Write a protein that binds this ligand. Structure first.
Ligand SMILES: *Cc1ccc(S(=O)(=O)N2c3ccccc3CC[C@H]2C)cc1
Ligand SMILES: *Cc1ccc(S(=O)(=O)N2c3ccccc3CC[C@H]2C)cc1
Ligand SMILES: [Ca+2]
Ligand SMILES: [Ca+2]
Ligand SMILES: [Ca+2]
Ligand SMILES: [Ca+2]
Ligand SMILES: [Ca+2]
Ligand SMILES: [Ca+2]
Ligand SMILES: [Cl-]
Ligand SMILES: [Cl-]
Ligand SMILES: [Cl-]
Ligand SMILES: [Cl-]
Lengths: 9, 231, 231, 9
């Protein structure tokens, strides 16, 4: 599962 | 170490370091900026988070590669794989301890606005979560509880003070859901949190401008991606 | 720094570091291995080269990003872009000096077989070339000449001792051609070298096994890619 | 222009 990225990309 | 450099110069160099993909430098510049003792703006909080998230993200990926090799070895390869995994693990723990130390001295205590306070408590939850991913000793339960407690305080503030589409509230819910699934052995709680977050955000999208809509829907899709993986 | 670790353990950990994409660690392990004072095998020479090529390659890419920003700035941004470019440049120079120091103490002087000696002299040419990419002072000409001289000695040995399809001979020619085009302002020499290398390798492919053919043709295609870019 | 990579890939 993915967590929030540091930037939108 | 950055004590002699101006705050504004540290911020400028953190931005340059990000452009050059020099994330260790970026983190050192932002640590220096925090240590000036002044609160951080929204943009500056994002520089701090980007820098450390990229540093610890690389350490986590390397730890996972090494831990997979070590588990497969358990022909006798000697102590080297375990020693090197331990080296990377100690480094990772050191970075997490550094971030937690910045949050405790004194970012969280001076953060009064909901946006800043939630952001920092989400970070606190995340770096305890990264410590929990590698923990195996007498303190594992306490590390998991420390992550839980930080995320819970952030959640309680976010639900009182931010709309359900706020990107910080959404990212917090995303990360806390990952905590439930991957750390706390609570996949049902993880799924519940992601679905209720997604549905409550959906119902508030009508209030948003085009650019705010784009931001909220991007994080909603991350929630949906995890729900598809988990169900 | 690695003085207390066994040679074999340093080699093993360099291999693990590569798998984990921890190239700074890899380079430190290989520096420790070289400093044990024993010659390196073919495989070990490749670990040394991979480690430092990846470290310096990242520094070069960051230096280029910063140098582009600095040239565009030349509104007054203050000294920070130049200072940070200088910081990265000093780091890069330090790594190149370290590699050159390993080659001079004492890898090259003990390398008697053509494969080892050519490999190390090619590396020497490469790290002087990386120093030349950032050089602007009184020693720029001497740095360029040092790269030239190392590559030339490697070329002279390779043409006497290796077949025209040998991958080390081919990679040396590739890199020396890049030197001519990008450093020495000699694009015609670069093109000539790449085309004669390619054509002489083509004419020797008939002697090779399937696996040797695959290796030689891979580098031939790199030569051809540069020729297409340059013509 | 490209120089030799560290590994075949
Ligand atoms: C935890 C958190 C941190 C920062 C943000 S954000 O809104 O600043 N933002 C963002 C906006 C929209 C979609 C994703 C993101 C993550 C990167 C940052 C720049 C949100 C949540
Ligand atoms: C400069 C140089 C160094 C190493 C080699 S190689 O033959 O060991 N090899 C290779 C084989 C085939 C095609 C490309 C390469 C570059 C990576 C290494 C592993 C050749 C030239
Ligand atoms: Ca000041
Ligand atoms: Ca066996
Ligand atoms: Ca405050
Ligand atoms: Ca020994
Ligand atoms: Ca102006
Ligand atoms: Ca010898
Ligand atoms: Cl962004
Ligand atoms: Cl180690
Ligand atoms: Cl600097
Ligand atoms: Cl390879």
């Amino acid at each position: 599962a993915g967590s929030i990225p540091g930037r939108r990309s | 170490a950055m004590g002699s450099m101006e705050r504004a110069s540290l911020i400028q160099k953190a931005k340059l370091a990000e452009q050059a993909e020099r994330y260790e430098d970026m983190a050192a510049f932002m640590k220096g900026a925090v240590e000036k003792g002044e609160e951080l703006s929204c943009e500056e909080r994002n520089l701090l988070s980007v820098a450390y998230k990229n540093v610890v993200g690389g350490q986590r990926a390397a730890w996972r590669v090494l831990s997979s090799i070590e588990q497969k070895s358990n022909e006798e390869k000697g102590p080297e794989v375990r020693e090197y995994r331990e080296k990377v693990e100690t480094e990772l723990q050191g970075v997490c301890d550094t971030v937690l130390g910045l949050l405790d001295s004194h970012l969280i205590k001076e953060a009064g606005d909901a946006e800043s306070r939630v952001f920092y408590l989400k970070m606190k939850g995340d770096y305890y979560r990264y410590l929990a991913e590698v923990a195996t000793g007498d303190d594992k339960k306490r590390i998991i509880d420390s992550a839980r407690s930080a995320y819970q305080e952030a959640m309680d503030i976010s639900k009182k003070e931010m709309p359900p589409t706020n990107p910080i509230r959404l990212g917090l819910a995303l990360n806390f859901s990952v905590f439930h699934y991957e750390i706390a052995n609570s996949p049902e709680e993880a799924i519940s949190l992601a679905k209720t977050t997604f549905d409550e955000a959906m119902a508030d999208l009508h209030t948003l401008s085009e650019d705010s809509y784009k931001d909220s829907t991007l994080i909603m899709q991350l929630l949906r991606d995890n729900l598809t993986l988990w169900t």
